[PDB]
Design an enzyme around this catalytic site. Structure first.
Site, PDB file in Angstrom:
ATOM      1  N   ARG A   1      64.410  53.779  45.580  1.00 11.11           N
ATOM      2  CA  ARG A   1      64.932  55.030  46.121  1.00 11.11           C
ATOM      3  C   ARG A   1      66.153  54.788  46.998  1.00 11.11           C
ATOM      4  O   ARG A   1      67.121  55.556  46.959  1.00 11.11           O
ATOM      5  CB  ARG A   1      63.840  55.742  46.913  1.00 11.11           C
ATOM      6  CG  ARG A   1      64.258  57.069  47.483  1.00 11.11           C
ATOM      7  CD  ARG A   1      63.190  57.592  48.413  1.00 11.11           C
ATOM      8  NE  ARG A   1      63.579  58.864  49.004  1.00 11.11           N
ATOM      9  CZ  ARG A   1      63.032  59.380  50.095  1.00 11.11           C
ATOM     10  NH1 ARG A   1      62.056  58.758  50.738  1.00 11.11           N
ATOM     11  NH2 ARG A   1      63.477  60.545  50.554  1.00 11.11           N
TER      12      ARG A   1
ATOM     13  N   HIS B   1      55.910  58.126  64.192  1.00 14.25           N
ATOM     14  CA  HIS B   1      56.968  58.609  63.310  1.00 14.25           C
ATOM     15  C   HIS B   1      57.837  59.622  64.050  1.00 14.25           C
ATOM     16  O   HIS B   1      57.311  60.626  64.555  1.00 14.25           O
ATOM     17  CB  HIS B   1      56.379  59.234  62.044  1.00 14.25           C
ATOM     18  CG  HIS B   1      57.400  59.565  60.999  1.00 14.25           C
ATOM     19  ND1 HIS B   1      58.154  58.603  60.362  1.00 14.25           N
ATOM     20  CD2 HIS B   1      57.780  60.752  60.466  1.00 14.25           C
ATOM     21  CE1 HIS B   1      58.962  59.182  59.492  1.00 14.25           C
ATOM     22  NE2 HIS B   1      58.754  60.486  59.535  1.00 14.25           N
TER      23      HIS B   1
ATOM     24  N   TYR C   1      66.901  66.177  48.910  1.00 15.70           N
ATOM     25  CA  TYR C   1      67.611  64.989  49.367  1.00 15.70           C
ATOM     26  C   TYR C   1      68.969  64.852  48.692  1.00 15.70           C
ATOM     27  O   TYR C   1      69.887  64.251  49.263  1.00 15.70           O
ATOM     28  CB  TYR C   1      66.737  63.758  49.132  1.00 15.70           C
ATOM     29  CG  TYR C   1      65.387  63.889  49.801  1.00 15.70           C
ATOM     30  CD1 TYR C   1      65.261  63.741  51.175  1.00 15.70           C
ATOM     31  CD2 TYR C   1      64.252  64.217  49.072  1.00 15.70           C
ATOM     32  CE1 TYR C   1      64.035  63.873  51.799  1.00 15.70           C
ATOM     33  CE2 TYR C   1      63.022  64.357  49.688  1.00 15.70           C
ATOM     34  CZ  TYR C   1      62.919  64.184  51.053  1.00 15.70           C
ATOM     35  OH  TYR C   1      61.700  64.320  51.677  1.00 15.70           O
TER      36      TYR C   1
ATOM     37  N   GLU D   1      68.098  68.804  57.465  1.00 15.56           N
ATOM     38  CA  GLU D   1      68.295  67.361  57.464  1.00 15.56           C
ATOM     39  C   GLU D   1      69.775  67.001  57.481  1.00 15.56           C
ATOM     40  O   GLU D   1      70.163  65.968  58.041  1.00 15.56           O
ATOM     41  CB  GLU D   1      67.602  66.763  56.246  1.00 15.56           C
ATOM     42  CG  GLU D   1      66.962  65.421  56.474  1.00 15.56           C
ATOM     43  CD  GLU D   1      66.006  65.436  57.641  1.00 15.56           C
ATOM     44  OE1 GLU D   1      65.166  66.351  57.730  1.00 15.56           O
ATOM     45  OE2 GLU D   1      66.053  64.488  58.446  1.00 15.56           O
TER      46      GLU D   1
ATOM     47  N   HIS E   1      56.307  61.610  47.306  1.00 17.02           N
ATOM     48  CA  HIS E   1      56.672  63.011  47.117  1.00 17.02           C
ATOM     49  C   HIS E   1      56.132  63.578  45.807  1.00 17.02           C
ATOM     50  O   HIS E   1      55.839  64.777  45.728  1.00 17.02           O
ATOM     51  CB  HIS E   1      58.193  63.164  47.181  1.00 17.02           C
ATOM     52  CG  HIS E   1      58.793  62.675  48.463  1.00 17.02           C
ATOM     53  ND1 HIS E   1      58.777  61.348  48.839  1.00 17.02           N
ATOM     54  CD2 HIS E   1      59.404  63.341  49.470  1.00 17.02           C
ATOM     55  CE1 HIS E   1      59.370  61.214  50.012  1.00 17.02           C
ATOM     56  NE2 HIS E   1      59.756  62.410  50.419  1.00 17.02           N
TER      57      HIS E   1
ATOM     58  N   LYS F   1      65.445  56.542  33.417  1.00 18.75           N
ATOM     59  CA  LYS F   1      65.791  55.534  34.414  1.00 18.75           C
ATOM     60  C   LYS F   1      66.915  54.637  33.910  1.00 18.75           C
ATOM     61  O   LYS F   1      67.904  54.402  34.616  1.00 18.75           O
ATOM     62  CB  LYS F   1      64.561  54.707  34.778  1.00 18.75           C
ATOM     63  CG  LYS F   1      63.653  55.370  35.791  1.00 18.75           C
ATOM     64  CD  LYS F   1      64.183  55.172  37.198  1.00 18.75           C
ATOM     65  CE  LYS F   1      63.137  55.542  38.237  1.00 18.75           C
ATOM     66  NZ  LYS F   1      63.624  55.291  39.622  1.00 18.75           N
TER      67      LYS F   1
ATOM     68  N   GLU G   1      67.358  63.354  65.782  1.00 19.44           N
ATOM     69  CA  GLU G   1      66.242  64.251  66.065  1.00 19.44           C
ATOM     70  C   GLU G   1      66.631  65.342  67.055  1.00 19.44           C
ATOM     71  O   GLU G   1      66.182  66.487  66.925  1.00 19.44           O
ATOM     72  CB  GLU G   1      65.048  63.456  66.590  1.00 19.44           C
ATOM     73  CG  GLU G   1      64.463  62.481  65.583  1.00 19.44           C
ATOM     74  CD  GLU G   1      63.968  63.156  64.316  1.00 19.44           C
ATOM     75  OE1 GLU G   1      63.555  64.334  64.386  1.00 19.44           O
ATOM     76  OE2 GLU G   1      64.002  62.512  63.247  1.00 19.44           O
TER      77      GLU G   1
ATOM     78  N   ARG H   1      51.680  50.205  40.436  1.00 23.87           N
ATOM     79  CA  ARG H   1      51.726  51.206  39.374  1.00 23.87           C
ATOM     80  C   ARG H   1      50.542  51.125  38.418  1.00 23.87           C
ATOM     81  O   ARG H   1      50.156  52.147  37.840  1.00 23.87           O
ATOM     82  CB  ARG H   1      53.038  51.082  38.599  1.00 23.87           C
ATOM     83  CG  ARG H   1      54.204  51.647  39.372  1.00 23.87           C
ATOM     84  CD  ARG H   1      55.550  51.140  38.909  1.00 23.87           C
ATOM     85  NE  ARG H   1      56.585  51.672  39.783  1.00 23.87           N
ATOM     86  CZ  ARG H   1      56.847  51.196  40.991  1.00 23.87           C
ATOM     87  NH1 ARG H   1      56.205  50.144  41.473  1.00 23.87           N
ATOM     88  NH2 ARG H   1      57.767  51.797  41.741  1.00 23.87           N
TER      89      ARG H   1
ATOM     90  N   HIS I   1      68.105  68.142  65.253  1.00 24.17           N
ATOM     91  CA  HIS I   1      67.142  69.145  64.804  1.00 24.17           C
ATOM     92  C   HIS I   1      66.817  70.129  65.918  1.00 24.17           C
ATOM     93  O   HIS I   1      66.803  71.346  65.699  1.00 24.17           O
ATOM     94  CB  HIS I   1      65.856  68.485  64.299  1.00 24.17           C
ATOM     95  CG  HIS I   1      66.008  67.744  63.006  1.00 24.17           C
ATOM     96  ND1 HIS I   1      66.229  68.383  61.806  1.00 24.17           N
ATOM     97  CD2 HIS I   1      65.927  66.423  62.717  1.00 24.17           C
ATOM     98  CE1 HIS I   1      66.303  67.489  60.837  1.00 24.17           C
ATOM     99  NE2 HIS I   1      66.112  66.292  61.361  1.00 24.17           N
TER     100      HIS I   1
HETATM  101 ZN   LIG Z   1      65.482  64.502  60.457  1.00 22.95          ZN
END
Ligand SMILES: [Zn+2]
Ligand SMILES: *[C@@H]1O[C@H](CO)[C@@H](O[C@@H]2O[C@H](CO)[C@@H](O)[C@H](O)[C@H]2NC(C)=O)[C@H](O)[C@H]1NC(C)=O
Ligand SMILES: *[C@@H]1O[C@H](CO)[C@@H](O)[C@H](O)[C@H]1NC(C)=O
Ligand SMILES: *[C@@H]1O[C@H](CO)[C@@H](O)[C@H](O)[C@H]1NC(C)=O
Ligand SMILES: *[C@@H]1O[C@H](CO)[C@@H](O)[C@H](O)[C@H]1NC(C)=O
Ligand SMILES: *[C@@H]1O[C@H](CO)[C@@H](O)[C@H](O)[C@H]1NC(C)=O
Ligand SMILES: *[C@@H]1O[C@H](CO)[C@@H](O)[C@H](O)[C@H]1NC(C)=O
Lengths: 596, 195
Positions: free
Chosen positions: A255, A327, A497, A384, A487, A463, A357, A151, A360
């Site tokens: 996260r 990935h 998300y 997702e 992001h 936070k 996957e 940071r 998808h």
């Molecule tokens: Zn996915």
């Protein structure tokens, strides 16, 4: 000829030209991601540039048809999406400034390095360098060093850029008649002109904050149980009533709390369900994994994979000489060409990923008959959510036992049941306050409700208050900690998300009820249930053609995001947590910090 | 024993673009229909009006062979009473059609890695086609109310578009070769009987 008929004809021509040009770019992109050379980079950029230039030309041409004079809603959706694509609302100079900023922030993030104190030649990147520390290290100081160095040397670089990034993004959004760039992002959920299914951009904020209130009790007891277990491992570093130090949360930002499972596992003597040994015992390969994942979708009534899928996909690592971007991704290149890029190993984790996957791919194939501009999930959280629910069923002991990977002589008990839900909650529940508080901060920055001189002040106040997480070092306004996450510095919205997590349990609860599942929701397997597959398919084949509220109702019977199925899925853990915390403090004091 | 030139039509090196579909008139020969099953399991053979089931004991005045290339999805439009870009703007069969439609996948011949743009089809037209009509006009389609002046521009589109056949396309977007046998019965002596 009317202006609507002119738009229909224009869209007809666009659909053809776009389908071919998009395919050329996707294929060129595929050939690079599977075979990394310098020539394949050039072909990917040439094909990409041509596609981008075609989209800019057609965006301008689409705007010469004014939306107020079209009545057909299906046409207006496509016209609006092509019009809302161009950024020809900012002068060429401000557009150029903004793209440079975007490139500089992305470059800083991906090449940012930190060199160990006492040696300038031992330097680490975020991935895999700093990520390895934050996900495996138990040493308080090492994790604090990685957290702070990332940071203070990469975050401080992004502060002056992000400040100018906000100004230009607001200018662009305001000139597109949005309140701010946050309102622009919330535009993904907007629905207009469909009586009974409309949804405004500002309604998203209220629904997110209303659903989040019902999540707080579960999160407070999850946070209380985690703090107690960490306090045992770090007695001098954690207060029984304070927030959790930000660098002790399992990754660079907290996260996901996934990597706290070892220190928080409820019953550490019962082993997890790992079928990796049984896969190797039965000589499974990658093709067997995806063949099984195909069988799963066929068992609910969905189509098998195309012949082009098996021939053209890359399901195993190419090899030593041929280098690839491993990935896992699902590719819809258009014109019936569906593929999966994935460097599959014979492990349980890749086995579940294959179902995710291929989930998808099922979505892509189901809306391939829609117009080009409407071939997408109903909103940003739909796609997702569909992928996740496949790995929910595929991983249950019920499904694992029926495919011969888990022994019939293995029976579930409520201790392994609790171990599973806790591990799930660490990932699924833990990310929700992290995700809501991050987007709320960005929504308020774009709105102007947070001055520049109080950016990092309000960031850590939120936070502590919302997430119950406290910074281990004071940070002034030379920092830009939110930008230290991918992001934020790479210009992606983040609330997807949160909405996806809620959708995925609304989906799974609905499909399991169609499957006549008896028992707790987390043990459900929709396999062999064609009624479940039909319910899901009725939403998949819609794509973007219908309002996301209607598409949601097709599956779950409600027009809006709901948090009750999420709480239903975690109810066995919720009651177990509350009984665990009966002699613990629940909640956190925001004034305590590890730097006294 | 004059044998009909079917090897000319079916085994042709290059088929015609469907907008400019190709017609071969057949007369004065023995039609050996029962030997046409010499393709990669030819994916379609559907007849209308007459029976394919060994009904080549029949005589016709003239037989017309029509050939073109479309994609797999569009083969359903080569039938009586169908609508779509092909049946409306390229090749239209009449309601009372008497004949047969033969089609097979030709991906190995008509696809190409850079994309085969040889085969075209008509995307825009002022009106639908009459049965067995052919329009090869390259006049710019006026979609707006301003004149086009023979060049492409806003609301002025070149009426033809290309199939861009690549071998990795799905089956629905792969090239299929089609042969349409139109059987004619006039008040004139039969010249085409096939034992
Ligand atoms: Zn996915
Ligand atoms: C305009 O449309 C294009 C369609 O591709 C969008 O480009 C994609 O955007 C997403 C998310 O930003 C990326 O994940 C893709 O990789 C992008 N593709 C390209 C072209 O590289 C683009 O975002 C749209 N612009 C907007 C926001 O209006
Ligand atoms: C990888 O790309 C190169 C071109 O840069 C090509 O010559 C080579 O054949 C490719 N290899 C494979 C296995 O596709
Ligand atoms: C809108 O246009 C599509 C395609 O032309 C058509 O199928 C649909 O019925 C139209 N809807 C309305 C409401 O006119
Ligand atoms: C998929 O299923 C259909 C029948 O439902 C079958 O004809 C086809 O061959 C199958 N495809 C593959 C790749 O097995
Ligand atoms: C499992 O369930 C039984 C129900 O009678 C309960 O007595 C037991 O304490 C539970 N065990 C755990 C570890 O939750
Ligand atoms: C085309 O060629 C093949 C092999 O040479 C032959 O079997 C077939 O009969 C030919 N087609 C026609 C219509 O004669």
């Amino acid at each position: 000829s009317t202006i609507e008929e002119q738009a229909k004809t224009f869209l007809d021509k666009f659909n053809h030209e776009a389908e071919d040009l998009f395919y050329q770019s996707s294929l060129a992109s595929w050939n690079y991601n599977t075979n990394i050379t310098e020539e394949n980079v050039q072909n990917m950029n040439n094909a990409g540039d041509k596609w981008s230039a075609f989209l800019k030309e057609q965006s301008t041409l689409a705007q010469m048809y004014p939306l107020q004079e079209i009545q057909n809603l299906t046409v207006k959706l496509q016209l609006q999406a092509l019009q809302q694509n161009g950024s020809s609302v900012l002068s060429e100079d401000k557009s150029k400034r903004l793209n440079t900023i975007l490139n500089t922030m992305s470059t800083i993030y991906s090449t940012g390095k930190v060199c160990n104190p006492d040696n300038p030649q031992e330097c680490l990147l975020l991935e895999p360098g700093l990520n390895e520390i934050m996900a495996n290290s138990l040493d308080y100081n090492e994790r604090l060093w990685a957290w702070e160095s990332w940071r203070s040397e990469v975050g401080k670089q992004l502060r002056p850029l992000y400040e100018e990034y906000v100004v230009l993004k607001n200018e662009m959004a305001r000139a597109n008649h949005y309140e701010d760039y946050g309102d622009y992002w919330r535009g993904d959920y907007e629905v207009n002109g469909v009586d009974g299914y409309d949804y405004s951009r500002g309604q998203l904020i209220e629904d997110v904050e209303h659903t989040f209130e019902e999540i707080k009790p579960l999160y407070e007891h999850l946070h209380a149980y985690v703090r107690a277990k960490l306090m045992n491992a770090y007695p001098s570093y954690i207060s029984p009533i304070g927030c959790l130090p930000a660098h002790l949360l399992g990754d660079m930002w907290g996260r996901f709390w996934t990597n706290l499972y070892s220190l928080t596992v409820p019953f550490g003597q019962k082993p997890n369900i790992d079928v990796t040994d049984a896969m190797v015992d039965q000589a499974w390969d990658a093709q067997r994994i995806f063949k099984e994942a195909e069988k799963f979708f066929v068992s609910v009534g969905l189509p098998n994979m195309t012949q082009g899928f098996w021939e053209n996909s890359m399901l195993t690592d190419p090899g030593n000489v041929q280098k690839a971007v491993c990935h896992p991704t699902a590719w819809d290149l258009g014109k019936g060409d569906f593929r999966i890029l994935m460097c599959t190993k014979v492990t349980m984790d890749d086995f579940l990923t294959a179902h995710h996957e291929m989930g998808h791919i099922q979505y892509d194939m189901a809306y391939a008959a829609q117009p080009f501009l409407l071939r997408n999930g109903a909103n940003e959280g739909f796609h997702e959510a569909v992928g996740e629910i496949m790995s929910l069923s595929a991983a249950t002991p019920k499904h694992l036992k029926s495919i011969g990977l888990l022994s019939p002589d293995f029976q579930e008990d409520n201790e392994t049941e609790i171990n599973f839900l806790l591990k799930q909650a660490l990932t699924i529940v833990g990310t929700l306050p992290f995700t809501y508080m991050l987007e709320k901060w960005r929504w308020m920055v774009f709105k102007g409700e947070i001055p520049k001189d109080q950016w990092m002040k309000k960031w850590w106040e939120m936070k502590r208050e919302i997430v119950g997480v406290v910074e281990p070092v004071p940070h002034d306004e030379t920092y830009c900690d939110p930008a230290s996450l991918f992001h934020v510095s790479n210009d992606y919205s983040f609330i997807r998300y949160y909405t996806r997590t809620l959708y995925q349990f609304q989906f799974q609860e609905a499909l399991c009820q169609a499957a006549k599942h008896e028992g707790p929701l987390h043990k459900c397997d929709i396999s062999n249930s064609t009624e479940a597959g039909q319910k899901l398919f009725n939403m998949l084949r819609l794509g973007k053609s219908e309002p996301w509220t209607l598409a949601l109702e097709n599956v779950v019977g409600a027009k809006n995001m709901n948090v009750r199925p999420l709480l239903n899925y975690f109810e066995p853990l919720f009651t177990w947590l509350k009984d665990q915390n009966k002699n613990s403090f629940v909640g956190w004091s925001t004034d305590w910090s590890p730097y006294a | 024993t004059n044998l009909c030139p079917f090897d000319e039509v079916f085994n042709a090196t290059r088929f015609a673009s469907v907008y400019a579909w190709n017609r071969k008139r057949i007369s004065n020969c023995v039609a050996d229909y029962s030997v046409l099953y010499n393709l990669a399991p030819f994916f379609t053979f559907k007849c209308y009006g007459v029976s394919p089931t060994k009904l080549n004991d029949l005589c016709f005045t003239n037989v017309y062979a029509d050939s073109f290339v479309i994609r797999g999805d569009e083969v359903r439009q080569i039938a009586p009473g169908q609508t779509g870009n092909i049946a409306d703007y390229n090749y239209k069969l009449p309601d009372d059609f008497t004949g047969c439609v033969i089609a097979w996948n030709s991906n190995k011949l008509d696809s190409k890695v850079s994309g085969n743009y040889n085969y075209l089809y008509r995307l825009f037209r002022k009106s639908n086609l009459k049965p067995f009509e052919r329009d090869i006009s390259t006049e710019i389609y006026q979609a707006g109310n301003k004149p086009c002046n023979g060049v492409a521009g806003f609301n002025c589109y070149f009426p033809l578009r290309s199939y861009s056949f690549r071998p990795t396309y799905g089956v629905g977007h792969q090239p299929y070769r089609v042969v349409v046998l139109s059987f004619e019965l006039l008040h004139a002596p039969a010249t085409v009987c096939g034992p």
